[PDB]
């Protein structure tokens, strides 16, 4: 994983260990808003016209 991704992830994990559900779920929502709902594992470098 990237650096920022791991940062956000272990941040939510510290929120869950810190039992703060509200801030935790909001941080997860921010994560999904900030990193999209899917990670790409394949693209096709090309062009079209």
């Amino acid at each position: 994983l990237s650096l920022g991704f791991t940062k956000a992830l272990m941040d939510i994990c510290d929120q869950l260990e810190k039992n703060q559900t509200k801030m935790a779920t909001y941080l997860a929502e921010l994560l999904i808003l900030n990193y999209g709902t899917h990670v790409i594992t394949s693209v096709d470098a090309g062009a079209a016209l």
Binding site: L3, G4, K7, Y35
Partner: protein
């Protein structure tokens, strides 16, 4: 026309001409071009900036 040898010898030609030539040319050209270009090359802010 007219003629005689006794009482009534004359001449007449009341010739007439009426001509009326009218032309009406009417030309109307109209051109209208519209053309539009677009390019994009996007940019996002990193999710961890301050």
């Amino acid at each position: 026309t007219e003629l005689a040898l006794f009482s009534r010898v004359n001449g007449k030609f009341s010739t007439e001409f009426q001509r009326m030539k009218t032309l009406q040319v009417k030309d109307q050209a109209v051109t209208t071009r519209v053309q539009v270009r677009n390019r994009i090359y996007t940019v996002k802010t990193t999710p961890t900036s301050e």
